[PDB]
Amino acid sequence: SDKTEPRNEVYKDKFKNQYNSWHDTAKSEELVDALEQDPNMVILWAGYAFAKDYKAPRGHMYAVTDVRNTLRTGAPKNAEDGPLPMACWSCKSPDVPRLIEEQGEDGYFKGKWAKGGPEVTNTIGCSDCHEKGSPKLRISRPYVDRALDAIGTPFSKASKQDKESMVCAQCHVEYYFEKKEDKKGFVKFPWDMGVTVDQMEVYYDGIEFSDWTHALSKTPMLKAQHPEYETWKMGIHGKNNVSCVDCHMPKVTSPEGKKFTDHKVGNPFDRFEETCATCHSQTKEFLVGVTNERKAKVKEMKLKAEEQLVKAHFEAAKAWELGATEAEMKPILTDIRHAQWRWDLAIASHGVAAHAPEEALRVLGTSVNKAADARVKLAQLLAKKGLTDPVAIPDISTKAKAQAVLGMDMEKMNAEKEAFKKDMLPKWDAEAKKREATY
Template sequence: MDKKVGLIGAVAATVALTAALAACAPQANNPVTDEAAMNAVPAQDQFGVVVAEQWQGLYPNQYRTWLDNEANSPESGKDNYLETYPQLATMYKGYGFAKGYDEAASHSYTLRSIAETPRVNEKTLANCITCKTPQYTAMVQAEGDSAYAKPFGEVLALMTEPVSCYNCHGNDPTQLEVTNGFYLNSLGNSVATTPVESQVCGQCHNEYYFNPQTKATTNPYVGTEAMTAEAILAYYDGIGFMDWEHPDTGAPLLKAQHPEFETIYGGAGSRMAAAGFSCADCHMATETDEAGTKYASHYLVSPLESEAQQEKCAMCHDDIAAEVRQWQEGVTRREHEIAAQIELYIQQLAAAKDSLDAATLEQAQQIHRHAQFYWDYVMVENSEGAHNPEACHQNLDKAEELLAEGFALLA
């Protein structure tokens, strides 16, 4: 299995029967019920955030399992995607991701990872810290869009807490809260139709861009119907947005981020979404402590790395590991095949562009832009197709069809 799966992992597939769905449904996380304990809210830091360590007395099981995420460290054997997909040096040429693109570590290392990436420089703005720490989330809540345009280094130096309790709960662990206002606005009416357990994950695991005028972190859609690669591409085309111009082809390119939420819930949605499952159902196992208290583990792993989660899957699947492996192998194989085609197309377009008339060149560059985006949208999604294999193959189909059109145009 690709090592990328260790970060986000694969979800279980469709649950066909209502009875099975009920049996697989998550156990509610036991909240603190003692009134005195509930009123004993720990002190907030300078940003108004109660950091995770402050909650360990009231929520020892959740805090202990949250600390377990430290095992998924940058030193734990991460892929260098520039080596795994050697074509990326050509595809991302002229953009920061060509300088460094490693498999992500867990939430415990979000601040360290953003501080150490070679993609930042003296021109980088604080908007790159979005979703790296709850303290920046609180800063944006307090200061509004102006916080996005601050200098990256200046703001990062103030941050001390990686992704933790506040990101998903605010300062009330008995509740779930989408603390990123930009994402809550982008959900639109879908707030009422998607599980809040998935919304709090989706507020960071999504496709976004930085508004060219305000520098604000922004989603290219409103509502789940518009959360498809095709609709997002149309949105970017409509506003003339690009992340960078490819130095060889001149194409105005886009860099997809990590559209986990869109892949699961966008458009027609995945089979898991249709069956009523949330991200937490698959990635946060229900466990029981020595006193017999059930709680939601905050150790975020692939369900294939959790015996408890696999027991849920086994109620509907004879061999969920084999199913997931088949999905991932199929998607990954096509990712490599199409990456080679994109690199070849870039080379041919670069060689031919000076001899093409303006209209043909524009069409060829548009094909480069679109085909690479459809491919990138699948490759960066972090489940290797397991979250929604049908949608992933459809996007790869579109990339292949565009490339075929482009090669014919250049012939």
């Protein structure tokens, strides 16, 4: 493609520093397993991909490796096989916009993750954010323009400051797969109403969109994904237009004394001076530990949330057993749907505590309130079917136990995934090395 060059090596000894800082995101390679840490999430995502496996983010250099390796994507034995669609690559690779730019957007989205297997191979690279080129920014994904148009703030007409965050908005945002209406499943961002929780909620309701039917409570669910752009705008740095880049891609001096933009997107605190120091007179120990307070305040009210929702789901599990009708459970489901949605959005983004604490907290208030209604309605309903004794929740204090409780063959999935990892990945990169994309 004449506009996208996905090979990330071309621009070394050419843009020396920027390639250098970009390659140092491989480095933060810590693979924190988030279910092992909080197994409630296994039961809230009962019935659905995230029940299987969910890790915290690591560096951009692992995007492709990580999408490949994760149980959710599966072990597909051919380009027609596999639970998930092409869309999955969209935010993992600068090969995406190459496919989009030649194939067409319609030709890129059609089929399965496995189809794009061999073609989407380079990790988040230069062409993802730049008009490479040569510097200067670019959106690269047409569906992303659409979402920015949709809230009334296109890229073309933004200030230099504005854009700095939009380039991240490409991926670090809540999405869904449209609508399965023939014409999609494209990646659309639910921002037509638009970006608050709240508005996103009415959007998905109005079109009755359901991410999946919950395995226990048979509730039509929404799943939130990393709403960094949407939560940022809500935070206090957000409203001052302190961009992603100010804190995440700061300007650092070369030894020679050349000032340039750090492309190592990780912790803004490593580069403390250069990030916070720019605008704050306090110390590293102080600002660090303030954010740790927030981190812990969110964490807290977060489990509280989870604890009711887990109790809500199983309490709905028993109602169906006891003989609840479709009509009897509809409102209890709605109430659960919202509560879990508001939980999930509140914390899918790992930096919410750092970005928009207050809002993060606002929405967990909102989630518990709704979990509340859910549970008391159920309370009254289980008694009409004769049960007036609290519902027993089995031991879910471990990933394995949570995954056992839901009837999941974990020793089969991992079995199949190593097969995929050894037999099928070698065949993919092999074909990708031969493409090259050589102009």
